Amino acid sequence: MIIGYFDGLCEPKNPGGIATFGFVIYLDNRKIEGYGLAEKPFSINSTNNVAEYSGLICLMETMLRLGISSPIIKGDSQLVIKQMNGEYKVKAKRIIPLYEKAIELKKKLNATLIWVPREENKEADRLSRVAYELVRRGKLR
Numbered sequence: 001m002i003i004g005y006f007d008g009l010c011e012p013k014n015p016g017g018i019a020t021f022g023f024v025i026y027l028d029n030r031k032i033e034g035y036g037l038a039e040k041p042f043s044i045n046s047t048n049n050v051a052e053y054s055g056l057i058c059l060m061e062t063m064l065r066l067g068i069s070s071p072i073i074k075g076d077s078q079l080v081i082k083q084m085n086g087e088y089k090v091k092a093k094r095i096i097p098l099y100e101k102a103i104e105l106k107k108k109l110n111a112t113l114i115w116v117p118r119e120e121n122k123e124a125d126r127l128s129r130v131a132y133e134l135v136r137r138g139k140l141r
Contacts, residue, residue, distance in 0.1 A: 008051025019046035021055030022127025
């Protein structure tokens with residue numbers, strides 16, 4: 001069963017920090033993972049939720065492009081998972097287009113999205129932090 005995980009962070013302030021994401025895709029014999037900048041650094045449009053959605057979108061885009069289908073996708077954002085499952089409304093103007101992109105991807109992938117606690121999402125967390133550190137080192141821009 002293909003399982004992907006995503007995460008996003010925004011530090012050292014939220015909002016107005018550096019927003020990064022990370023994701024990991026588990027296949028039985030190999031792993032593919034990704035991490036990066038979600039928004040322009042220190043911009044007022046870097047937010048935690050934008051970062052989380054960006055990690056989700058990049059995860060599902062990567063899956064789609066690789067020909068993965070019917071994955072299970074796990075994250076530790078209750079808000080994002082509940083929005084993606086039709087259980088919380090999306091009303092924030094900057095989240096709406098990201099939610100829409102993610103919903104189209106979820107439909108195309110026949111993805112199932114479930115919440116797990118933070119301590120079960122450590123790899124994707126770690127990768128969002130690696131991305132953050134890389135931005136601080138001028139290695140992602």
